Structures are given as structure tokens and as C-alpha cells.
Amino acid sequence: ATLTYPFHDWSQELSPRYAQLRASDAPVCPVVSEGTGDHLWLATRYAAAVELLEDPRLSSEAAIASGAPRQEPVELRAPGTRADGVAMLREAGLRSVLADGLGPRAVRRHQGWINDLAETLMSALASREGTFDLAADFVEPLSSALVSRTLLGELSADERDLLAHCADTGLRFCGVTHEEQVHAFTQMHEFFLEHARRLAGTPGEHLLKLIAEAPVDHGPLSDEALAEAGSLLVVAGFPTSSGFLCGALLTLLRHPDAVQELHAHPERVPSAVEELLRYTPLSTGSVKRMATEDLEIDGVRIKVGEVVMVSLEAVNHDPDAFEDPDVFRPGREGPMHFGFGRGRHFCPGNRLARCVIEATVRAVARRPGLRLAVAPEEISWHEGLFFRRPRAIPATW
Ligand code: HEM
Ligand SMILES: O=C1N[C@@H](Cc2c[nH]c3ccccc23)C(=O)N2CCC[C@@H]12
Numbered sequence: 221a222t223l224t225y226p227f228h229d230w231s232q233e234l235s236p237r238y239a240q241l242r243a244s245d246a247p248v249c250p251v252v253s254e255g256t257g258d259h260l261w262l263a264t265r266y267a268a269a270v271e272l273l274e275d276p277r278l279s280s281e282a283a284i285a286s287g288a289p290r291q292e293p294v295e296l297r298a299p300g301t302r303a304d305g306v307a308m309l310r311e312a313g314l315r316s317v318l319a320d321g322l323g324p325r326a327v328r329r330h331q332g333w334i335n336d337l338a339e340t341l342m343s344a345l346a347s348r349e350g351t352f353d354l355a356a357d358f359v360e361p362l363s364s365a366l367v368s369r370t371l372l373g374e375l376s377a378d379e380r381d382l383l384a385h386c387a388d389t390g391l392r393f394c395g396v397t398h399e400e401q402v403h404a405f406t407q408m409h410e411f412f413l414e415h416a417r418r419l420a421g422t423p424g425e426h427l428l429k430l431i432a433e434a435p436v437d438h439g440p441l442s443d444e445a446l447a448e449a450g451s452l453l454v455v456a457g458f459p460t461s462s463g464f465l466c467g468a469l470l471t472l473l474r475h476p477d478a479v480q481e482l483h484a485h486p487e488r489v490p491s492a493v494e495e496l497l498r499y500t501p502l503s504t505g506s507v508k509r510m511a512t513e514d515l516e517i518d519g520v521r522i523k524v525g526e527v528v529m530v531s532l533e534a535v536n537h538d539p540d541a542f543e544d545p546d547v548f549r550p551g552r553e554g555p556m557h558f559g560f561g562r563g564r565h566f567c568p569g570n571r572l573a574r575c576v577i578e579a580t581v582r583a584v585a586r587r588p589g590l591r592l593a594v595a596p597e598e599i600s601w602h603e604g605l606f607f608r609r610p611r612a613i614p615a616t617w
């Protein structure tokens with residue numbers, strides 16, 4: 221009868237449904253959730269997303285709450301915990317501590333090691349003969365170091381592997397049983413419940429130590445409170461950063477001509493980062509908000525309690541806002557991309573993300589000739605992940 225969501229486009233080829241809803245006159249089109257039966261609005265167009273994500277009558281906190289109509293098959297929350305995300309740290313008056321942790325002065329703390337590590341990892345692959353896996357031998361150490369040094373603390377390899385596996389298990393639309401999904405969030409929470417304070421006390425300036433050592437006016441940040449901060453940091457930072465870095469690499473390796481230009485012209489690198497954030501698809505789902513009062517958008521009513529989704533992928537590929545939208549064009553001068561969102565809930569990790577993405581682009585650009593060792597079609601993808609990620613990326617020089 222009507223389209224069901226999500227659209228099962230687990231590779232970098234976006235579903236032709238996004239294009240189809242975008243070409244519609246409507247600012248929103250009705251879809252039905254596969255895993256809940258919930259009816260939902262989907263927006264695909266730059267013009268519509270611009271209005272929908274700046275409207276304070278559309279609430280992110282509501283659409284996170286239990287009972288909200290939703291796209292995901294299970295609550296993204298350990299049963300019995302709060303998991304309303306960053307609002308909990310906001311509530312405890314931690315606005316200045318997230319500023320110190322993710323703001324410009326943290327990028328100055330960490331940007332030096334991040335750039336040297338990216339160069340080192342690419343230098344090591346340059347030593348190999350034949351074929352190597354960029355996902356395991358570049359993306360995984362780089363995103364792990366990002367997560368551990370700027371967010372979590374020193375992980376052991378097995379702890380890191382545990383946190384990755386839980387993220388990959390919980391953050392899915394399909395492919396695992398719902399009981400495993402629920403247990404992945406439980407497994408993360410009990411880990412942080414038992415190790416958050418030790419992780420916060422290890423050396424470094426990582427965000428979890430800043431949270432733990434912060435003085436809450438009239439408060440001690442509880443261990444239950446610390447654990448939820450750690451779950452949020454893994455969920456927000458780890459699968460997003462690894463998913464995107466993998467996709468960005470496939471984008472770069474498929475455009476050798478663009479990469480040569482960045483090699484000749486290093487001042488162009490920061491602009492190619494932004495184009496990567498617009499061109500490279502990440503989420504198989506949508507950002508979402510709940511109408512807390514009736515409203516109207518270009519002739520469509522949105523009643524109280526209805527849920528509006530905006531697919532960042534569809535909007536970043538909107539020909540109305542981006543000429544030749546399927547072309548990777550680092551010189552492009554258009555509107556701001558929707559890769560970190562827009563409005564009040566703009567990604568607060570956006571400056572750390574940009575810094576790792578830029579290190580990676582530079583590391584590719586210093587060593588030209590790096591190319592896919594298999595056709596893009598023979599690449600194998602994890603299916604059902606919220607955040608697209610290839611199984612491996614075979615590459616050679
Ligand atoms: C160190 C890495 C990262 C950290 C710590 C981080 C953290 C966060 C957090 C805590 C939020 C919640 C904001 C809110 O609900 O108000 C968020 C939102 C968001 N992040 Fe990041 N993130 C990271 C990486 C990324 C990357 C790599 C991307 C894209 C390539 C990304 C895209 C987004 C988007 C689109 C949102 C908007 C969610 C919405 O509007 O509902 N993030 N991020
Ligand atoms: O703070 C939040 N923000 C949004 C978007 C988001 C950002 N990063 C995410 C990772 C997975 C799911 C959603 C998001 C959200 O839906 N939330 C559920 C988990 C974290 C919480």
C-alpha cells in the first residue's frame with residue numbers, strides 16, 4: 221500500500237526511493253516503519269529539512285522517549301536506564317565541560333597525534349606488497365584511538381572490541397534478534413557501571429575524565445550517571461566515525477583524479493573534507509523529531525504526536541540545493557551540507573570528526589596511486605547497520 225521504512229540500501233548506492241520522494245511536490249511523504257508498524261513522515265528535500273530542523277515545535281527529546289513512534293526495532297537504551305542522551309549531561313550543568321571536551325581547544329590538544337597516527341598507518345600499508353584491508357588496518361586503529369584518547373580513556377583491545385561489537389549489535393534495523401539487541405545495550409551499561417570510574421582516572425584529557433572530575437553544583441556524578449555518559453559516547457562516536465571513515469576512503473579511492481588535485485594543492489584539503497561529508501552516505505535511517513504542537517509545512521499538517529524524519533543522505537543529494545549532486549566535486553561552493561545535522565542538535569563531535577577526516581584525506585593525498593583492489597560492486601557490506609560500514613576494503617598500490 222505505502223512505502224515501508226527503512227529502504228535496505230546498505231551499500232553506498234542510496235535507495236531510488238529517496239530520489240522518488242524528493243521529486244514529489246510534498247514537503248513530507250508518509251511511510252510505515254517495518255519493525256513497529258508506526259506511521260511516519262519522511263522529508264527528503266533541502267528546502268523542507270531547512271524548516272523542519274530549525275522549528276522548536278519539533279522535539280528530539282520527545283522522539284527519543286519510550287512510546288514515541290519510531291523507525292528502530294528496539295529502544296536504544298539498556299532496560300531500566302535513562303538514555304535520553306546528552307540532555308542528562310545538560311541537566312547536570314555540564315555545558316562548559318562538553319565545551320572543553322569537544323570544542324576548538326580539544327581539537328588543538330589532539331590534532332597533532334591524530335595527524336601523525338593517520339600518516340603512520342598509511343606508511344605501514346605502503347610497506348606491504350599486494351593487497352591489504354584499509355578498514356581493519358587504517359580505519360579501526362584510527363577511530364579506536366579517537367574514541368579512547370578523546371572520549372573514553374585507555375581501553376584494552378578486548379574492551380574496545382567489546383564496545384565495537386555492542387554498538388554493531390544494538391544499532392541495527394535488522395539482522396539480529398531483538399533480545400540480542402537489548403542485551404547489547406545492557407552489556408555496554410554494566411561494563412561502564414563497573415569500569416567508568418577507572419577509565420575516568422587513567423591519564424589523558426578524555427571527555428569521560430572531564431565529566432567525572434567536574435563539580436556538579438550540588439552534586440556527585442553518580443556511577444550510574446557516569447555509565448550512561450560512556451554508553452552515549454560509544455554510541456554517538458564509535459560506529460559513526462568508523463562508518464564514515466570507511467565510506468570516505470571508498471569515495472577517495474574511486475576518484476583518483478580528484479585525489480591528484482588535493483596532492484598538487486594541499487590548501488584544497490579542508491574543502492574536500494566538507495564535500496566528503498556531503499557526498500558520502502552514512503546513516504541508513506533518518507534524524508527524527510516529534511511535533512509537540514500542530515504545525516503546517518508548505519501546505520501539510522503535522523499533528524501533535526506525529527514523528528518527522530529527515531534523511532541527511534537524501535538532502536545532501538538534492539539537486540535543488542547541489543548542482544550535479546552525485547558528483548564528488550571538492551571545489552563545490554553551495555549551501556552547508558547536512559552531514560552533522562542542522563539546528564539545535566548539530567553534532568557536538570563535529571570538530572573532532574572533521575579533524576580525523578582531514579588527517580585521513582591528507583594521508584591518502586600524500587601517497588597517490590592507492591586504489592581499489594576489487595570492483596566497487598564486489599565490495600561486501602554489513603547489512604542492517606544504522607551506520608553503513610563495509611566488511612573490508614581491499615586496496616593496493
Ligand atoms: C568523535 C566523534 C563523534 C561524537 C563524540 C559525536 C557525538 C554526537 C552526539 C553526542 C550527538 C547528539 C546530539 C543531540 O542529540 O543533541 C550527535 C549528533 C549527531 N552527529 Fe555526532 N558524533 C561524532 C561523530 C559524528 C560523525 C562522524 C558524524 C557524521 C559523519 C556525525 C553526525 C551527527 C549527526 C547528523 C547528528 C544529529 C542527530 C540529530 O539531529 O538527531 N557525528 N553526535
Ligand atoms: O543524543 C542523542 N541524539 C539522537 C541522535 C543520535 C546521535 N548519535 C546517535 C547514535 C545512535 C542513534 C542516535 C544517535 C538520538 O536519537 N539518540 C539516541 C542515542 C543518542 C541520542
Ligand SMILES: O=C1N[C@@H](Cc2c[nH]c3ccccc23)C(=O)N2CCC[C@@H]12
Nearest residue numbers: 291292460503504505506507508532606
Ligand atoms: O540510524 C539512525 N540515525 C540517527 C540520526 C542520524 C542520521 N544520520 C546520522 C549520523 C550520525 C549520527 C546520527 C545520525 C537516529 O536518530 N536514529 C534513530 C534510529 C536509527 C538511528
